[PDB]
Amino acid sequence: RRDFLYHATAATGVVVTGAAVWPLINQMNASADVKAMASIFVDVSAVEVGTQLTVKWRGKPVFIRRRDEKDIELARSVPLGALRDTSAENANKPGAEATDENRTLPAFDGTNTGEWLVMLGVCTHLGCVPMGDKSGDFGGWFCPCHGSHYDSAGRIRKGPAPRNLDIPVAAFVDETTIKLG
Amino acid sequence: RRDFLYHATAATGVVVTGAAVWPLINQMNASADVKAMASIFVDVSAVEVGTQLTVKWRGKPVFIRRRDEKDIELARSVPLGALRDTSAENANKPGAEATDENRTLPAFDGTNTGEWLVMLGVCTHLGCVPMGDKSGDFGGWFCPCHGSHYDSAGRIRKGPAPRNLDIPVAAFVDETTIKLG
Amino acid sequence: SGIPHDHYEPKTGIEKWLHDRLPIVGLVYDTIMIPTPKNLNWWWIWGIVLAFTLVLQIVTGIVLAMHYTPHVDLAFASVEHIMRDVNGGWAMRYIHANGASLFFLAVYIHIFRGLYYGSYKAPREITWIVGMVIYLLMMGTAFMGYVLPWGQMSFWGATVITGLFGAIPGIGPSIQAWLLGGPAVDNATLNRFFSLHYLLPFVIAALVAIHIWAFHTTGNNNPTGVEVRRTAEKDTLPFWPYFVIKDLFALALVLLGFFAVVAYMPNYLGHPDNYVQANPLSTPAHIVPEWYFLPFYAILRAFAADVWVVILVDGLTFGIVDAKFFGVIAMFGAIAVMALAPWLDTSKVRSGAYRPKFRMWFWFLVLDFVVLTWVGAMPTEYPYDWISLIASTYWFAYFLVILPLLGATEKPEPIPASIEEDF
Amino acid sequence: SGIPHDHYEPKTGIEKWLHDRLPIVGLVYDTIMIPTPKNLNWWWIWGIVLAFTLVLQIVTGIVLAMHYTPHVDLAFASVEHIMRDVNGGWAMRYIHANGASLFFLAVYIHIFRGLYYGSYKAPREITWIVGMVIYLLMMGTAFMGYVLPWGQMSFWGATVITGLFGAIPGIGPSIQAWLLGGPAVDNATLNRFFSLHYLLPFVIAALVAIHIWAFHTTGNNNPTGVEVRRTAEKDTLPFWPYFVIKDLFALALVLLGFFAVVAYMPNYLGHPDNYVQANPLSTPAHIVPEWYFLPFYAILRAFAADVWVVILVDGLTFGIVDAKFFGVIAMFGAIAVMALAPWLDTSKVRSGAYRPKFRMWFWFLVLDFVVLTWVGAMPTEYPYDWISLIASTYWFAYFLVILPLLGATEKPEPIPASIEEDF
Amino acid sequence: PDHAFSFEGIFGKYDQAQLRRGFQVYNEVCSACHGMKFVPIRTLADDGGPQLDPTFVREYAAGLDTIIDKDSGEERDRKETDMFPTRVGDGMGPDLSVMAKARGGPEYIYNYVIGFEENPECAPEGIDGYYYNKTFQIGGVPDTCKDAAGVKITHGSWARMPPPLVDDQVTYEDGTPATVDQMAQDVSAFLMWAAEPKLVARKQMGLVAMVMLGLLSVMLYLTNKRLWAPYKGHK
Amino acid sequence: PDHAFSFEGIFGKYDQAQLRRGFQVYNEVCSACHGMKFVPIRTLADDGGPQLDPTFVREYAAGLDTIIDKDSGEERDRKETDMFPTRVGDGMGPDLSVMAKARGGPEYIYNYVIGFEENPECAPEGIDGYYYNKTFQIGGVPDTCKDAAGVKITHGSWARMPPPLVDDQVTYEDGTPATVDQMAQDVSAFLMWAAEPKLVARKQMGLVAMVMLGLLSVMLYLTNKRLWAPYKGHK
Ligand code: HEC
Ligand code: HEC
Ligand code: HEC
Ligand code: HEC
Ligand code: HEC
Ligand code: HEC
Ligand code: FES
Ligand code: FES
């Protein structure tokens, strides 16, 4: 029939066109060489605890910074109230409250948390690298792209950045190493 | 005046257009990094005289091959007659006849010529690399791009290639070295 | 009326055998002897400027691509190979880089000329639509291009202006990854950008094809709210040679200034940090993307829930429309509303040379544009936040409400007749 | 006669407000409802094939350029990155590489269809000129492209097909160096070729624009020596939907075969030596540039002063016209004479379906083309030299002398009237 | 007869046990001289070929040579993301990444590895440092074996590679007679993988496309026959 | 006053003696830590800057570090065609190829090299391993010198570079007082060369083009005034 045959030819043409178009939009996706996206062993190895440590991985920096008491007390003295993101973005644990006890890090295979904190050095606003070394209006990190003030533990404050600095999955290698991945 | 003013405006426009066009045609010329085009010290260093020696330079190969008696006698037994190019392309000397005495090479800082011959391994037809190691119908080199038969001393024979294998400017470094440039 | 004067192909046998391919008929009848009014000021030149600048950019780029190597490890080195070894080098690069600046400067004056003399008003909607489409294409082009040198500003500008697409929910990260070729920026992004950057200009030329086809079919706007009175038209001198020569004179002046810049002030409009190689591990201060995107950058980074006029706290009614998405929508709307203008101005009138209130509001708009340009570079600390918010609010207010109210109560002026204004 | 049927824009308000930009008027009146005769065989499809193939190549190339890195040290590696990691990879490359083959195969049938049915005869000269220009552009394109993988055949093909330009005297080496970017081949040549290779297709599209404009203004040839009898023309059905559907059916068949090849016989038309990296120090045996340049390669390497019909010994009268230059002129002339044809055939007649002697000579010409194709691959040793010389001589003889003699004494046939051939 | 492989046809998606055997062979024999830079190690988990266990891949990678770095010169642990090593010179050979395409290909490798017999009865002395092959065609030939015009009278020529395998060079874990012929076939298939890993996807795409386009073409033929009916009915 | 250079203006084609002095200093002082990879050694003969004698260039090149190769790993003779060396880490600094543009540029270098005075009277102890500079602005500052909101009260900050020169570090062959200021100016000019070698050509092109385009524009203005005369005469 007129209608059936004509419309079916059109439908088949459309289907073939789409099957040909999809790969032109698929090739731009991450290729297998980008699929890898594996782990990195960074050795703390006495870098003079308290200033900072940055390492490249996955194309983004991974901040490993020891703790300075003044920085710590400022951290532990932050009630969940008035905290933009209280989710403790760290993926090594559940959505537990963004508390310094949970938010600092594992305990060297020992029992302590207020001494090391390794987070992803990527601003949640649009992915810039905040400046460290005690900066901003909260004694933490400052993003120069739009002005987002981070705190000691990395929780976002005073800016458009919606959430704090995430924490990747990491465990220790018996007191001198870090496993990122 | 009408004519003068109009034609002069047109002339000025044309001149400016040409001054703007020339560099678009000049940039494609050899750049300063290609201007260099300097020399190379290849060490003969006992490579078992008689087979061959090739080295890269200026983007083209420079053939340094010792002489095999049978190859030599075939060379020295070639009268200028029936020789396509009798100019002895070698630029280390004048346009003297393409004779093996002049065409082989300098004499190690000594006195002998029928033992070494270094020429530019570039077919004069269109720039292909002839195959060595005793090939062709004359016991020399054979060009596989169009079929040009070279002789023992490198003079062109049996093919479209108009001239023989040129010889760059080269002198010896006291019995174990070659200076190309 | 609309005298095409096809020339009847009566010249000679050459002009008679050309009845196989009409081409010269087209040129003569239409694109050279196109009746244009006499009342044209010096604001109707910038289109010639834009065409020439586009040709210039295309040429210089085709030349550079003979020495640029798209790769993270060999881009900077190739750029220096250009500026040092190549014969002309610095010239091509400075002419390419700065000419983009002139291009955008010229489109700004081309656009604001339009907003004044009702060139968006009917029957000239298609030209406006095509022009906004172009503007978009050329913005994207310049963005893709600022990345190729693989300096330091390249990396971070790309980072943020791609995190935008990721702000939106559900389909943000997917688009981000599909655009960057991966989670973050690397050589794949560079290849995409080079290709794309080496392809869109031709689309622009075609769109310019339609741009020129439209306003030849539709008469050029004129300083007055009047047409060429087709019904024989003592007004409306032709294009060639009069306006051709006028435009070429202005263009010579403009190129003179442009080359003076190129030769004395070439690194002025640039960012020095783009002369240091990239470090994905260190971000410089004051990225300041460029100068032809600061308006929208500011409209973006203004809405942050930091003012009593903060509509983000109200838009939070829906848990999906956060701040970032709000700013992105605000920018896209800042452009979409400029495109929608011709259906917002409810006036049966024309050029604001006979609409005073419109004059005042329009000069305020120009000032707002300049202010936004100056604010995108300064931090988000007080007082600049209030300034940016005010300016964005006025932009939207103008384009949404102001024009209707005028079209209602904005006719205290005697319109001029007889486009032949022999004053 | 020549019913354009502009549609009068009477559809509705949408088709009436489109009086701002005519575009749909153009499409409908001209490029869709173009009266074409009924007498069309299956040889009038290959133009659609060529257009589709061109689009295909442009698309696949724009995709590849997102992963190809022009540089001697990273081209091969990028090609393998494509064929292994990328999602589609092998498909794009095989479709790009082989589609060039189909492109040239299709132009060959497009051209030889033309030589038979007097499509070069008046009043269709402009189409012929434009087609030869295109052919040149696309040959140069494919050449620039075979180089990009930086295999082994790339290098040497480039070497020789650039030494050609250097053969000529006085201005040979200068042009050679200005084209290679230096004395010999290196990355500079690669960059030039990539850019150029990524730019000409658009020029081809424009030229295709003029190609299509011409034969719409000038009626499509038709199997006979007759026109559409404009004066109403019961003959000459329209293009859409009839011929559109016919061409699309043939195109579906062709793509079916093409993809079967791509998926089962993809490396068949290629040279394996192009899968080994380049060595400027070692040349392989039987470079054999490609299969769409063997005719001219043979016409070139035939004249060598090795036959009693060797006109090189006679051309040596002037000490400047050596062999090489003679072969280069012979090739350029092999093409220039094909372009000059329409002014050599001195016949007030048309399609060889009514000219027997022409049929015989033409089939001999097709055979000569095939033979030249088969000979450019075989060495210059006896007997192939005599064969190549004979074939080139016949090519030139046909195109220079044969057509005049026919036009003189070639009318023993009853021409058909009434292009409505209801047989 | 010709000992056709599995992939030689419109089907034959790379029988994987054969490829695992070829891998046992390549890493223990051919790797001593040859390399495959154009081949990432992670491909030993991608579908189509040897779908080995990733952990074994990481182990085998760390057990290889040291590929230093691209940013900071320091001998790393050679993660799978890198490529197979490269043996370059001093008694070494070319790269086998795509040698299965630079020659019907794999049959060349089979009939090459197969065939290193003693020197014939024209030049039994042979050559010092060079060994004889019956199928390689790009090697030297002594003057004693050439004809009157330089052409060789031997089937093959002299190759610089020594005989790679003896009667029972290695053991197969699956359980199989590991004679020379089976090893040659297996390694040929492995190299063909290393060159064309996306073969099976090629074939499946070809099938799908042939089908869809045959359908489209049939429908268009019907549409054509219909439209052109009132003009081709009286004749 | 501001100690303007020669090139600071519409003229000033790089007084070359200044550049030779800057070279004497760069190779003997700054080269110990810094490098200029983006700079070929063959530019010391190109016009515009130091038009040194090529032979001295080849000598000075062979007298530098060893840049190994790109094809065959082997420590060569560091031919001029290569680029200046690169000092990368372990107490070393960035590349000075284009540092004269990544900052009015050379004035930064002058007023930076100039200024390393002792620690002020806010933190006289200073820092261990870091030294103080009047003009560097991207360095750390002790908490004793910061204000109530993190901003520094010092003009400059603490830079990791030590003082490069003393009162009379090197001798000039031409004959000139080699105090610190003259050396700073000279080396600043040398770096500006290394960054913008094609400056003088820039200026000459600008002059030529300004002239030709002014001429063209004047002629077009006359043509316009003429053509538009019969329409602008009665008013
Ligand atoms: C050194 C002890 C080798 C080992 C073990 C293997 N190969 Fe090799 N191979 C080697 C050399 C020096 C050469 C060059 C030979 C020449 O005359 O140029 C080769 C060559 C090959 C080739 C290419 C043959 C050709 O036609 O060019 C192939 C296909 C090949 N070799 C295969 C191969 C395989 C499968 C091996 C493991 C079973 C193997 N070779 C080991 C050196 C050495
Ligand atoms: C090691 C003993 C050095 C020598 C000798 C010189 N420089 Fe240097 N320089 C060095 C370091 C470690 C740094 C980094 C400083 C930091 O805090 O990051 C530098 C830096 C510079 C700079 C850049 C300053 C800036 O604003 O970033 C310049 C312009 C500079 N140095 C110049 C310079 C000159 C001209 C020298 C020779 C006279 C010289 N330096 C010597 C290490 C060392
Ligand atoms: C044929 C290629 C090509 C075309 C066409 C082209 N460019 Fe470019 N562009 C390049 C190359 C190559 C670079 C990198 C070299 C450079 O930066 O000068 C570049 C860089 C740029 C830069 C950064 C300049 C710098 O030095 O950082 C901008 C801005 C830019 N392009 C804008 C444009 C715009 C806008 C257009 C047209 C609408 C355009 N380009 C047309 C090739 C091209
Ligand atoms: C967003 C708006 C916009 C953009 C961007 C734009 N145009 Fe226009 N253009 C217009 C309008 C509106 C007119 C007035 C048409 C009329 O008067 O009929 C116009 C007119 C013109 C004219 C004729 C009269 C004049 O003003 O010179 C030319 C030529 C022209 N444009 C070229 C260009 C080129 C070339 C570009 C880009 C490369 C461009 N334009 C970009 C909207 C635009
Ligand atoms: C947008 C870019 C682009 C366009 C347009 C394009 N190609 Fe290519 N072409 C490439 C790239 C990239 C390569 C190298 C990768 C490859 O070989 O597949 C290439 C390679 C080739 C090759 C060698 C194929 C091989 O694998 O050795 C040929 C032949 C070729 N092109 C011909 C053409 C012809 C003929 C056209 C159109 C008339 C065309 N190309 C259009 C990008 C393009
Ligand atoms: C050297 C000659 C030549 C070349 C190459 C050529 N054409 Fe043609 N083309 C012709 C001639 C002659 C005609 C017949 C015109 C007529 O009958 O009025 C024609 C007709 C056509 C037609 C309409 C009738 C038909 O035969 O299908 C199309 C469509 C077409 N060409 C497209 C193309 C495209 C697309 C290309 C290249 C990408 C191309 N041609 C290359 C000479 C050429
Ligand atoms: S990107 Fe980090 S705050 Fe804007
Ligand atoms: S190129 Fe050497 S003979 Fe043709």
Residue numbers in the entry:
A (entry chain R), B (entry chain E): 11 to 191
C (entry chain P), D (entry chain C): 2 to 232, 237 to 428
E (entry chain D), F (entry chain Q): 5 to 107, 126 to 257
Any passages from the paper?
CIII2 is a dimer with each monomer comprised of three subunits: the Rieske FeS (FeS) protein with a [2Fe-2S] cluster, cyt b with hemes bH and bL, and cyt c1 with heme c1 cofactors. The FeS protein external domain (FeS-ED) is mobile between the b (close to heme bL) and c (close to heme c1) positions. In R. capsulatus, both the diffusible cyt c2 and the membrane-anchored cyt cy carry electrons from CIII2 to CIV in respiration. Here we report the cryo-electron microscopic (cryo-EM) structure of this functional bc1-cbb3-type SC (CIII2CIV, at 5.2 Å resolution), together with three structural conformers of native CIII2 (at 3.3–4.2 Å resolution).
The bipartite SC + cy samples also contained smaller particles (~110 Å length) that were the size of CIII2 Supplementary.
